[PDB]
Amino acid sequence: RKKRPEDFKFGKILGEGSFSTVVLARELATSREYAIKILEKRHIIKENKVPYVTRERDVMSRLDHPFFVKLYFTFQDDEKLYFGLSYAKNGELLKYIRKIGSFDETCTRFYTAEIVSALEYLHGKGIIHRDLKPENILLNEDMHIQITDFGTAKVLSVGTAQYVSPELLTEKSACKSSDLWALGCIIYQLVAGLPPFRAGNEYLIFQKIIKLEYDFPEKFFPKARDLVEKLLVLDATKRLGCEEMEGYGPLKAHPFFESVTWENLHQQTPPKLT
Ligand SMILES: COc1cc2ncc3c(N)nc(-c4cncc(OC[C@@H](N)Cc5ccccc5)c4)cc3c2cc1OC
Numbered sequence: 001r002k003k004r005p006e007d008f009k010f011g012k013i014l015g016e017g018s019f020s021t022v023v024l025a026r027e028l029a030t031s032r033e034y035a036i037k038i039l040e041k042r043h044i045i046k047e048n049k050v051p052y053v054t055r056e057r058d059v060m061s062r063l064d065h066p067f068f069v070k071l072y073f074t075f076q077d078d079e080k081l082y083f084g085l086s087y088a089k090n091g092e093l094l095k096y097i098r099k100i101g102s103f104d105e106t107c108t109r110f111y112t113a114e115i116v117s118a119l120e121y122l123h124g125k126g127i128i129h130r131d132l133k134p135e136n137i138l139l140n141e142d143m144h145i146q147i148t149d150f151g152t153a154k155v156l157s158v159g160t161a162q163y164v165s166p167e168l169l170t171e172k173s174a175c176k177s178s179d180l181w182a183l184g185c186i187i188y189q190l191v192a193g194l195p196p197f198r199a200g201n202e203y204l205i206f207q208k209i210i211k212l213e214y215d216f217p218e219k220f221f222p223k224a225r226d227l228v229e230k231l232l233v234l235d236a237t238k239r240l241g242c243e244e245m246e247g248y249g250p251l252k253a254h255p256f257f258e259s260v261t262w263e264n265l266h267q268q269t270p271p272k273l274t
Pocket of ligand 1: 016021022035037069086087091136
């Protein structure tokens with residue numbers, strides 16, 4: 001039952017990283033399209049990434065939720081590892097952010113809610129993403145979210161500069177509140193069109209993060225602003241959603257989510273992005 005590279009018609013490259021390439025592939029026997037993550041074993045071994053790639057596969061195996069990528073199969077030849085993943089026809093969220101400039105209130109609320117429910121599921125399994133951002137949040141043919149990129153994910157017993165939490169720059173310590181921080185950055189970015197902390201280089205961005213140096217544009221939705229101010233908290237113990245703040249209940253009960261039906265989000269028809 002183990003699939004082979006010969007079982008597929010490989011097509012365009014969807015994405016490229018340091019340790020992997022993601023390529024569109026049509027399975028010949030079924031006509032099914034998969035997004036196959038291809039990883040060179042030699043490069044992984046040379047850079048000591050074996051624990052990372054092992055963990056990534058193990059994390060993805062545990063995922064059984066509509067707002068996350070699914071791992072359908074794995075195989076390998078002499079050179080390469082192949083992970084068969086969900087194909088998300090509409091690509092990254094970042095692409096839509098840049099195309100329409102910024103989301104209105106309805107689209108912000110709906111897509112924020114989908115990320116919240118996804119994180120609720122993820123954190124309830126004791127798994128932490130650690131690199132949450134619009135580039136890693138895909139959209140399927142129905143325009144529902146599909147979170148991907150589990151290469152730096154952590155299972156409990158630095159990600160991208162702009163979405164890095166203060167505690168990560170202090171104690172070098174990562175937990176659930178790091179994801180919730182990144183959530184606050186994403187909400188801001190959906191409403192404003194750009195992430196909250198921006199500077200000339202990485203050092204200057206890190207400076208702004210630890211000082212909490214960011215401004216809301218005047219037109220920012222008041223209830224969205226109020227939510228962002230409760231996620232972008234320097235003390236990781238005081239952020240909405242975290243265990244010390246009594247979890248996801250209070251987060252979901254925030255006035256910004258007033259009209260949200262949380263129980264069936266993935267079967268609701270997504271609002272048009274205009
Ligand atoms: C039509 O457009 C697209 C459709 C797609 N469908 C399914 C996907 C899937 N299951 N996983 C990934 C994915 C898997 N590992 C890591 C990832 O990191 C994204 C970035 N940090 C940079 C990057 C890319 C590739 C490898 C490593 C890092 C992404 C991407 C896609 C995907 C991407 C598409 O366009 C970009």
